[PDB]
Ligand binder design. Sequence first.
Ligand SMILES: COC[C@H](O)C1(Nc2ncnc3[nH]c4cc(Br)ccc4c23)CC1
Ligand SMILES: [Cl-]
Length: 167
Amino acid sequence: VNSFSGYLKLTDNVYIKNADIVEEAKKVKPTVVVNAANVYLKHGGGVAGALNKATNNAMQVESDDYIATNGPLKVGGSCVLSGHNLAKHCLHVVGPNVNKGEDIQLLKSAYENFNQHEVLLAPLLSAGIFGADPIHSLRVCVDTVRTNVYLAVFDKNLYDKLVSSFL
Ligand SMILES: COC[C@H](O)C1(Nc2ncnc3[nH]c4cc(Br)ccc4c23)CC1
Ligand SMILES: [Cl-]
C-alpha cells in the first residue's frame, strides 16, 4: 500500500492521473520524482522548469555542480540527485528531444532507467516541449517499465485522450 491517490490503473504496474507533478510531489513526498531533464541539466521550462522553480532554484544549483564534476548526461541516460522539498530523490531522465532531431528509439532506453527504482512519480518522457507523441510515450512506458510508476499528466484534455485511446 502506498499514498498515491486518485490514479486510474492502466496495467499491473502503471497508474495515471490528471495532475500537476509539482503539486503531486509536494503532497505525496515520493521516494523518487522523475524530472524530464536534458543532458546539461538546464531546467529552463516544461516539467524541469516547473520542478526547479518549486525548489527555489536549489535543483539548478545542485545540477550545475553535478555537470561541472561529471559532464553531460547521455540522451537515454539518467542521474539520481536530491529531491529537495519535493521528494527524497529526483531521477533526472533524458528522453530524446524531437525538436533536436534525436532518435525516438532512445525513448525505450530512457524509460529503462525507471526499473532501478521500485516506485516512482513521473511525467511522460519526451512529451510536452520535447516534441514526441504522448500516446507513443505512454505505450513505451507500459511496455518497458516493470516497477510501479505513477504518471502525472498536466493537461486534462491530453489525459482524457491517453485514457480513452489506451490499448
Ligand atoms: C502536454 O505536455 C504536458 C505533459 O504532461 C508533460 N508535462 C508535465 N507533466 C506532468 N506534470 C507537469 N507539471 C508541469 C508544470 C508545468 Br509549469 C509545466 C509542465 C508540467 C508537467 C511533458 C510531460
Ligand atoms: Cl512540458
